[PDB]
Design brief:
The structure holds six protein chains of six kinds.
Chain A: H1 2-15, H2 22-36
Chain D: E1 3-7, E2 11-12, E3 17-25, E4 33-39, E5 45-51, E6 58-60, E7 68-73, E8 78-84, E9 92-99, E10 110-111, E11 115-119, E12 126-127, E13 132-134, E14 142-147, E15 160-165, E16 172-176, E17 180-181, E18 190-193, E19 197-201, E20 211-217, E21 229-232
Parallel strand pairs in D: 2-11, 13-21
Antiparallel strand pairs in D: 1-3, 3-8, 4-5, 4-9, 5-6, 7-8, 9-10, 9-11, 12-14, 14-19, 15-16, 15-20, 16-17, 18-19, 20-21
Chain E: H1 8-40, H2 49-65, H3 67-72, H4 81-85, H5 88-115, H6 121-142, H7 145-150, E1 151-153, E2 162-164, H8 169-202, H9 210-242, H10 250-267, H11 270-280, H12 283-292
Antiparallel strand pairs in E: 1-2
Helix pairs in contact in E: 1-2, 1-10, 1-11, 2-5, 2-11, 5-6, 5-8, 8-9, 9-10
Classes of the chains: A mainly alpha, B little secondary structure, C mainly beta, D mainly beta, E mainly alpha, F alpha/beta.
């Protein structure tokens, strides 16, 4: 059966990858959030003069 | 306006059988819209019959 | 065979998982422990879009953050100007059993599909002054679940026949076929670089596909029921899923595992849509209990509730400039929130 | 192929009536609003009448109000102008113009070939201040238009349009809303301006681009054109 | 043959009318306001029924608004002057007739929906959007010409009686007959007929959906006729007395007047019965009300 | 809106209102049609039911739509037999149809399933009917039950008794009792008898009266809708 061979090949391809630490991965999300926090209208609402939906 | 609050003349039948023969007292009533109302109590009948609208003797007397 | 195959593979599943336990030094909840919360998020309804006469099944924003397209199961695609609530175009569909719709990033085309197993491409900039069907893509043996434009001549679709397809619009032929899911694929999301996309299927699994080669890169599990929605993080290094088990989850591409779980004991209904804000700090989800929930994506705290719909919320959207949110429900109304 | 063909023009006596017909082929006639415009002999353009899509709105110029009537037959794809009490100021060449109105549309984008009528015999002011300049191929030139009122609305739009009329042809759209380039127009053309002053740049010149350039406003519905700037040689 | 004053009856009315009028005013204002609020705070497509009930609620509210004005009367003189006594008659008459005409229109709409279910959408829309203004509100407005012409404030012994004065009793009899005809006969024949037809067709059915409808139709018929029959019987008897056909003593006239007052007070409860019978007994309206009691 | 808008904004609003008018007209037209969902299991005879009205009256395909007209009433029937995917992911799309037609072959009681040799075809149809009838999306939706191939059933009942299926059946083993017994077992699966109805017809009648039956079964349903719409219920 070639389906089992395909599954084995796919699992072998998936296993041979390089992973980073979870603590290192969360830090990047935190850094992106703090770097773009001030440009988020939903997180920090803008005054009614610059609101296109004022409505 | 509700019918229960409507005004009606106490004198609808005007009969002058008395001819001043019998009238103990005679007053004319006041009405928003009923021309002239009269209740002449009769000396003998005291039924205050409503006398005729246009008859000479009271008109001369009044 | 049944020996040295389908059994040695179970060994590989014991290796990857082991490699996933050696990279879990800490958790996301501990890294972001000493950060300030976002407070209470209060949003108001600014616009209400009326004109559909059945349940709205899908919606999509234009790249100019002003024009949007919506699909209803009354045979109508409507293009709305959200600033003035004006209707720009009303497109009647040949099949009314629509379940998805897309807006081209250029703004010249729209896409539609549903229970007819066909993806229809409509031209909006004809010289005749009307909208006409530009193309009909056929080849799927199941219903169309989602579709997203890559450019004016490329589109990716997911079908209920457990497959995904990358098409050539000018020729009408399938260019690439992506296979490997067990159940029906219900959603897809394109990465900001367009070079990758994720798909979630009814087998409670998500997969990451490389567009230019057509092979599966990574598989992510952890849910307990069908995945109904999927969305990419703004920087393209993570994604979020919503399932039928009343739970959202966050997965990291490089860490290759799950990061955060968003669930509550009060919530027991399924999730239909997910979205991120411009900075990625907020995660917006639509539920069957007629409400939309705004979660703090870094602390897994429910920050806000959007409640203005009398039936289940079926679609969500956030503009490219991050100004407003759009919600579409199983009633005939779309709402803009600020 | 979009086509508008106009008929019904000829020599008329002072006082009388005449009907002009405009037949459309190749596009959805019912979705477009229609305009009648005229050009006097050796003069500029002059807006005459407008009828909306669905006949729910009709506008006339002050000089033809009470004697001109505009109508449309949508099943037959025809537009009619009935003119009565014709004076010696009505002898001109009449054009049929189509224009559609939604967010991001391009109004005034197609004109007819025109029909000639000969009689035997506050509005915004748009100033061009220049009637003829000499140009040579390969060089760059500029055309200036000035308005008596600020054309910028309180929604971000500046309603100014540019048209080119080549010798022997009908006007064609170049720029709409002062910045957008019409379909099928070379990138050499550009437009820019403030709320009151506007500039159109042709960049390199060719055997084309020779003719009369007009600026039009679309803020207040009494529509006014410029005098027309002529580009010779 | 002797004067027949109305003093004991007036004394009884002075106590009876204000209390019942206040109770009716409270109940009607509450019910009709609730119905109007539920209709207003609803985001759907309005059907044919949810236009008739809007008309009915507006008419009932405008009718019940005038009740305190005449509750102040019969215990005290008309304090509101000459202008206010006018147009109060107008509001009263307009809404009194419009309510029953709307009821007849609802009956006809139900008949069309039930007996011609597959081919009635266009006539039902035509009746609900266009013919309702000509068949309900225009006749009700036209029937108030005597209110403009004749209603006026008079003067009496330490009292200001405002009324609808007529040149003679023939006008009173004619307008009483018109009241009987418009208020009872014309709407009573259509509504009853439609309901009976619906029943004859709903008599044989599986049940649990048509058995409920049969009893609701019977309830509607009984409610309308029990509310409006004795009052008009008394009105007809009074009209016959006014024509001198029925001649008796003054005690008979006093008894007839007391019967008329009590039955008219009872018949005024239609403006409170209508929200229950035409809005609150329906599952669809109950669902709409539950939906409306979630956004507040 | 009002006097703060420009001319182009007013024209756009007019276009939007025309679109709204057309949408309302389309919705009013669509509300008058009768939508039916056609369901079955295997050789139930769905093709024979579809062929009852061959007139139009107006890769793998997913849903088949059939239109026909009877007594000035328009019916659209939807066949979803092609769809091989998960049914629970798209069944809610049909919440709101007028009725469900369910076809069952009477002769499919001796035969067993091809793949599952030890499973009855009638039992499989019963499980499908039980799943559809008690579905959460079809609480107030009525079912028209078609029982096909009575001519073959009345002959197969002779050689084989009605004991291979229904082991607890005690009857005369004739058609007039076995068919009535089968109808009883099919109607006993309904657990919403206070909100929905089952209409059963033995549609081995080669004439067209089949559609007539549907007409009747539809009319009743519509009446029961109006009683709820008008507040009577």
């Amino acid at each position: 059966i070639a389906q089992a061979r395909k599954l084995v090949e796919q699992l072998k391809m998936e296993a041979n990858i390089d992973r980073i630490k979870v603590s290192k991965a969360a830090a990047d999300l935190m850094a992106y959030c703090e770097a773009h926090a001030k440009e988020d209208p939903l997180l920090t609402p803008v005054p009614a003069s610059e609101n296109p939906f004022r409505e | 306006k509700p019918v229960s609050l409507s005004y009606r003349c106490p004198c609808r039948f005007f009969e002058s059988h008395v001819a001043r023969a019998n009238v103990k007292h005679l007053k004319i009533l006041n009405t928003p819209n009923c021309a002239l109302q009269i209740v002449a109590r009769l000396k003998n009948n005291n039924r205050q019959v409503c006398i005729d609208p246009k008859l000479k003797w009271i008109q001369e007397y009044l | 065979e049944l020996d040295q195959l389908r059994q040695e593979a179970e060994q590989l599943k014991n290796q990857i998982r082991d490699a996933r336990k050696a990279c879990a030094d800490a958790t996301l909840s501990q890294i972001t422990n000493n950060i300030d919360p976002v407070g209470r998020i209060q949003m108001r309804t600014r616009r209400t879009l009326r004109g559909h006469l059945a349940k709205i099944y899908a919606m999509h924003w234009g790249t100019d953050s002003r024009l949007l397209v919506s699909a209803s199961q009354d045979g109508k695609l409507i293009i709305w100007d959200s600033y003035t609530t004006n209707k720009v175009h009303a497109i009647p569909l040949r099949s009314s059993w629509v379940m998805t719709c897309a807006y081209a990033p250029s703004g010249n085309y729209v896409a539609c599909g549903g229970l007819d197993n066909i993806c229809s491409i409509y031209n909006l900039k004809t010289r005749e002054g009307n909208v006409r069907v530009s193309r009909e893509l056929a080849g799927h043996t199941g219903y169309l679940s989602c579709c997203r434009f890559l450019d004016d001549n490329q589109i990716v679709t997911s079908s209920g026949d457990t497959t995904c397809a990358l098409w050539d619009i000018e020729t009408g032929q399938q260019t690439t076929t992506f296979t490997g899911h067990t159940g029906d694929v219900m959603s897809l999301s394109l990465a900001p670089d367009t070079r990758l996309f994720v798909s979630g299927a009814c087998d409670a699994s998500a997969k990451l596909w490389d567009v230019r080669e057509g092979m599966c890169r990574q598989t992510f599990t952890g849910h307990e029921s069908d995945i109904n929605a999927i969305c990419f993080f703004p920087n393209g290094n993570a994604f979020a899923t919503g399932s039928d088990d009343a739970t959202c989850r966050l997965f990291d591409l490089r860490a290759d595992q799950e990061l955060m779980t968003y669930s509550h004991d009060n919530i027991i209904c399924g999730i239909t849509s997910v979205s991120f804000s411009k900075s990625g700090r907020l995660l917006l989800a639509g539920y069957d209990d007629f409400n939309c929930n705004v979660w703090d994506a870094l602390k897994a705290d429910r920050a806000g509730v959007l409640a203005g719909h009398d039936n289940r919320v079926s679609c969500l959207g956030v503009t490219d400039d991050g100004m407003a949110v759009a919600t579409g429900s199983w009633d005939s109304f779309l709402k803009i929130w600020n | 192929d979009v086509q508008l063909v106009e008929s019904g023009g000829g020599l008329v006596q002072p006082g009388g009536s005449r009907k002009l017909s405009c037949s459309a082929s190749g596009f959805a006639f019912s979705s477009f609003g229609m305009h009648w415009v005229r050009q006097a002999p050796e003069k500029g353009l002059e807006w005459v009448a407008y009828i909306s899509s669905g006949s729910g709105t009709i506008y006339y110029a002050d000089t033809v109000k009470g004697r001109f009537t505009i109508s449309r037959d949508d099943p037959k794809n025809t537009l009619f102008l009935q003119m009565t009490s014709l004076r010696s100021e009505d002898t001109a060449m009449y054009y049929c113009v189509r224009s559609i109105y939604y967010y991001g549309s391009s109004p005034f984008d197609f004109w007819g070939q025109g029909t000639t009528l000969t009689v035997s015999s506050s509005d915004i002011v748009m100033t061009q201040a220049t009637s003829s300049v000499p140009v040579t191929p390969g060089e760059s030139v500029s055309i200036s238009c000035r308005s008596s009122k600020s054309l910028l609305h309180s929604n971000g739009n500046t309603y100014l349009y540019w048209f080119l009329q080549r010798p022997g042809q009908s006007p064609q759209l170049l720029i709409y809303r002062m910045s957008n380039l019409a379909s099928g127009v070379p990138d050499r053309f550009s437009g820019s301006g403030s709320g009151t002053a506007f500039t159109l740049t042709i960049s390199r010149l060719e055997a084309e681009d020779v003719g009369v350039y007009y600026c039009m406003q679309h803020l207040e519905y009494p529509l006014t054109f410029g005098a027309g700037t002529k580009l010779e040689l | 043959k002797e004067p027949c004053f109305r003093e004991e009856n007036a004394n009884f009315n002075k106590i009876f009318l204000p209390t019942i009028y206040s109770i009716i005013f409270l109940t009607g204002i509450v019910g009709n306001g609730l119905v109007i609020l539920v209709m207003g705070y609803q985001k759907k497509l309005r059907s044919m029924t949810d236009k008739y009930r809007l008309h009915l609620s507006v008419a009932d509210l405008l009718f019940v608004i005038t009740l305190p004005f005449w509750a102040v009367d019969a215990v005290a003189n008309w304090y509101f002057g000459n202008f206010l006594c006018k147009a109060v008659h107008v509001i009263y008459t307009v809404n009194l007739y419009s309510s029953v005409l709307i009821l007849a229109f609802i009956s006809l709409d139900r008949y069309l929906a039930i007996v011609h279910a597959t081919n009635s959408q266009r006539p039902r829309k035509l009746l609900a959007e266009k013919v309702v203004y000509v068949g309900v509100w225009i006749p009700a407005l036209l029937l108030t010409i005597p209110d403009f012409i004749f209603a006026n404030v008079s003067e009496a012994d330490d009292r200001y009686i405002c009324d609808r004065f007529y040149p003679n009793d023939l006008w009173v009899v004619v307008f009483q007959f018109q009241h009987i005809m418009v208020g009872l006969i014309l709407p009573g024949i259509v509504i009853l007929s439609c309901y009976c037809i619906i029943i004859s067709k709903l008599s044989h059915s599986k049940g649990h959906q048509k058995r409920k409808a049969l009893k609701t139709t019977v309830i509607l018929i009984l409610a309308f006729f029990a509310c409006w029959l004795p009052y008009y019987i008394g009105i007809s008897i009074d009209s016959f007395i006014l024509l001198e056909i029925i001649k008796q003593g003054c005690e008979f006239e006093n008894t007839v007047h007391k019967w008329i007052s009590i039955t008219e007070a009872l018949a005024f409860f239609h403006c409170c019965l209508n929200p229950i019978l035409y809005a609150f007994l329906g599952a669809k309206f109950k669902t709409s009300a539950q939906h409306a009691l979630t956004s507040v | 809106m009002g006097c703060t808008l420009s001319a182009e904004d007013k024209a756009a609003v007019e276009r939007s209102k025309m679109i709204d008018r057309n949408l309302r007209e389309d919705g009013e037209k669509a509300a008058r049609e009768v939508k039916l969902l056609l369901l079955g299991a295997g050789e139930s005879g769905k093709s024979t039911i579809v062929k009852q009205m061959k007139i139009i009256h107006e890769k793998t395909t997913g849903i088949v739509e059939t239109h026909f007209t009877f007594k000035d009433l328009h019916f659209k029937m939807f066949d979803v037999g092609g769809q091989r995917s998960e049914r629970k992911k798209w069944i809610h799309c049909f919440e709101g149809v007028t009725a469900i037609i369910f076809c069952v072959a009477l002769s499919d009681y001796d035969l067993v399933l091809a793949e599952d040799e030890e499973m009855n075809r009638m039992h499989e149809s019963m499980k499908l009917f039980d799943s559809i009838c008690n579905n959460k999306w079809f609480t107030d939706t009525s079912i028209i039950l078609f029982l096909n191939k009575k001519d073959l059933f009345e002959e197969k009942i002779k050689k084989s008794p009605l004991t291979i299926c229904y082991p607890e059946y005690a009857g005369s083993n004739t058609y007039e009792e076995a068919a009535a017994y089968i109808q009883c077992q099919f109607e006993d699966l309904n657990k919403r008898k206070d909100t929905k109805e089952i209409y059963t017809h033995f549609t081995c009648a080669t004439d067209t009266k089949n559609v007539q039956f549907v007409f009747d079964a539809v009319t009743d349903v519509i009446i029961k809708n109006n009683l709820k719409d008008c507040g009577l219920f």
